[PDB]
Structure formats: C-alpha cells, structure tokens
A paper describes a structure:
The most prominent regulator of p53 is the Ub ligase (E3) [name], which binds to the transactivation domain of p53 through its N-terminal p53-binding domain, thereby inhibiting p53’s transcriptional activity. Furthermore, [name] catalyzes ubiquitination of p53, where monoubiquitination promotes nuclear export of p53 and polyubiquitination leads to proteasomal degradation. ATM phosphorylates [name] on six residues (S386, S395, S407, T419, S425, and S429) that are close to the C-terminal [name] domain and far from the domains associated with p53 binding. Here, we show that S429 phosphorylation selectively enhances [name] homodimer E3 activity, but has no effect on [name]-MDMX heterodimer E3 activity.
A prior solution structure of [name] [name] domain homodimer determined by nuclear magnetic resonance showed that this region is flexible and adopts various conformations, suggesting that the 310-helical turn configuration observed in our structures might be a product of UbcH5B–Ub binding. Since flexible or disordered regions usually lack electron density in crystal structures, we also crystallized and determined the structure of cat [name]-422–C-[name] to 1.21 Å. The asymmetric unit contains two dimers. The electron density for residues 429–C was visible and [name] adopts the same configuration as seen in the cat [name]-422–C-[name]-UbcH5B–Ub structure (r.m.s. deviation of 0.30 Å for all Cα atoms). Despite contributing to crystallographic contacts, the region preceding the [name] domain is able to adopt the same 310-helical turn configuration independent of E2–Ub binding. In all the structures of [name] homodimer bound to UbcH5B–Ub presented here, the N-terminal region preceding the [name] [name] domain adopts the same 310-helical turn configuration.
Residue numbers in the entry:
A (entry chain B): 424 to 491
B (entry chain A): 429 to 491
Amino acid sequence: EIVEPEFPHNAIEPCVICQTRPKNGCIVHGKTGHLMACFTCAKKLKKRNKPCPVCRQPIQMIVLTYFP
Amino acid sequence: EFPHNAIEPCVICQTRPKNGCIVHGKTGHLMACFTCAKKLKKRNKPCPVCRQPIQMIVLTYFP
Ligand SMILES: [Cl-]
Ligand SMILES: [Zn+2]
Ligand SMILES: [Zn+2]
Ligand SMILES: [Zn+2]
Ligand SMILES: [Zn+2]
C-alpha cells in the first residue's frame, strides 16, 4: 500500500516509461497533474491518445516542467 | 541533471512541498507549494521566477 510521502523523494528518479530521462513532462488533466515521465514520453502518450497511466484521466496537455 | 530542486521546500513559505506548478505557455515552473502559487494566481501576480503571467496552477503529484 504505497502512499507517496509529503516531499517528492522520487522526483529525481528517471521517467517510469523510458527509465533514463528526468521527470519533466507533467501530464495535466483539469487542475491536477501526474509527473512521472519525461517530456518526450509524455508527449507520445498524448499524441497516441492514451490516458494518464496513473489515474486514467484523458490527457489535456503536457507541460514541460522546470525546477528552478 | 535530475530535479533535486524539486525536493527542497516551497521557495515562498519554506515549510511545504513543491506541488504548485506555475504554468505559462507550454512550460511550468515548479518551485512553490499549491497554496502559495494559488495566492499568486488569484491576485494576478506573475510567476515568481520568470515574472511571466500565470496561465494556471497545476496541483502536481509524483506517483
Ligand atoms: Cl510579483
Ligand atoms: Zn521517458
Ligand atoms: Zn493522472
Ligand atoms: Zn508555500
Ligand atoms: Zn515562470
């Protein structure tokens, strides 16, 4: 029963799809977003009309996310 | 270069995790918590980092 912690300890782990690139492709649906994939992989999900893998909501857009 | 900055606390309040992504155009700057970022959007203040107008706040999760 893995509940995510308060702070995003896994933010530095690689994209869960390609397993090499940083998590910078935020999958946005409504006012929430799941950030577990890189921009390239997340764009491919939307291009191929696939839903967000985590919550299964339709993907409205991918936001290229920076962490300044 | 992986986002180690993402694990630091909200730049504005220093006590909450960075889950308020500030969207502008097709990009987002994630450095503030949702509460602080929403206060900025409600007051039509710009992104703290790049000072561009805020399109929306995305409540962000790291699953
Ligand atoms: Cl300001
Ligand atoms: Zn990827
Ligand atoms: Zn989702
Ligand atoms: Zn804050
Ligand atoms: Zn910005």
